[PDB]
Amino acid sequence: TLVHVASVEKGRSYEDFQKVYNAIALKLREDDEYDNYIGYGPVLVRLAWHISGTWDKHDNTGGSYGGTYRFKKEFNDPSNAGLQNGFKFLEPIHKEFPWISSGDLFSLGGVTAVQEMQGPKIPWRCGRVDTPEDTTPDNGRLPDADKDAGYVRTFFQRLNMNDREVVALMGAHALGKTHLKNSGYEGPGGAANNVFTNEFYLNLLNEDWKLEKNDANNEQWDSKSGYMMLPTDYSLIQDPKYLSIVKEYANDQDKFFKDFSKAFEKLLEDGITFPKDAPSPFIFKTLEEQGL
């Protein structure tokens, strides 16, 4: 097992990272046309998850620490198709703040997107350090979408996530859309595509889902409202243990926010050793809170 010790960018503190957060948040507001006016929030959340989701608890390979998405093997992962849009969004931010590590930037993009979309506060820690190209994990560590509840449960054990953590994390599927050209799936998960709510769970329980084939010849569950669920999403109401948790989150917005915040921070920090004297996690103010 590799050890990755968090190392604070030299001399930086909360205020420096709040400036980076603010730059990301301002660009999120500015570049509003993207993806038929969804904006960049959802793709930034997906990027933060995919750079973290390569982690393997068994040997501490992959994970957000090394910023390895910047290397061709990882950014060309078929599982990452479309994330180049998020990377391009972050490029001017990195140019303005060249001192931030790549892993810190990609993970902070996800935190900023969740909060700016009115989601929960997500505490965030700095100190990821870029590692060399040979530390890039091979393709194939991110999950397939065509599988069942047992696949999802087993998959997430590798990321040290339990049933509650898995169901909470999947609530991010309220955001954005599937794009046929990226993933072979098409459509949004609900009405509020760029506002962070518990709608994923409500839609799973309340919509009338039909199992259909899309134009890429893949199965997905579709509702007459024009929403979709991946087979892996739908598995959360097929498995009785997942179903209980889906119902809980559909009925308690605050509980979902609190559990999502914990699981998402954990996801973004998997693989990182934080020294005992490392700074406490930062909680960034939103632009709205700052009057900006």
Ligand X SMILES: C[C@@H]1C=C(N)NCC1
Across the chain, where does the E strand assignment appear? 4-5, 177-178, 187-188, 210-213, 219-222, 228-229, 272-273
Stretch that binds ligand X, among 64-72, 105-113, 157-165, 225-233 (CB under 6 A): 225-233
- SS3 for 177? strand
Instruction: Provide the minimum distance between the beta carbon of 177 and ligand X in the complex, in angstroms, as a whole number.
Output: 5
Task: Supply φ then ψ for residue 139, to 5 degrees.
Answer: -60, 155
Stretch that binds ligand X, among 132-140, 205-213, 224-232, 243-251 (CB under 6 A): 224-232
Q: Contact at 8 Å (CB) between 148 and 44?
A: no
Work out which of 188, 209, 261, 263 binds ligand X, going by CB under 6 A: 188
Examine residue 143 and tell whether it contacts ligand HEM (CB under 6 A).
yes
Examine residue 177 and tell whether it contacts ligand X (CB under 6 A).
yes
DSSP label of 238: H
Stretch that binds ligand HEM, among 181-189, 195-203, 216-224, 272-280 (CB under 6 A): 181-189
Closer residue to ligand X, CB minimum distance, 18 or 84 = 84
List % helix, strand, coil for the chain (3-state, nearest 5): 50, 10, 40
Examine residue 43 and tell whether it contacts ligand HEM (CB under 6 A).
yes
Instruction: Give the other-Cβ count within 10 Å of 284's Cβ.
Output: 24
Closer residue to ligand X, CB minimum distance, 107 or 178 = 178
- According to DSSP, the residues that pair with 5 across neighbouring strands are 273
143 to each of 62, 127, 160, 191, 198, how far by Cα in Å? 14, 27, 14, 25, 22
Closer residue to ligand HEM, CB minimum distance, 12 or 119 = 119
Give dist(CA 170, CA 201) in Å, integer: 9
Examine residue 230 and tell whether it contacts ligand X (CB under 6 A).
yes
Examine residue 80 and tell whether it contacts ligand X (CB under 6 A).
no
Instruction: Summarize as ranges the residues that interact with ligand HEM (CB under 6 A).
Output: 42-43, 45-46, 49, 82, 143, 145, 152, 169-170, 172-173, 175-179, 182-183, 185, 230, 232, 264
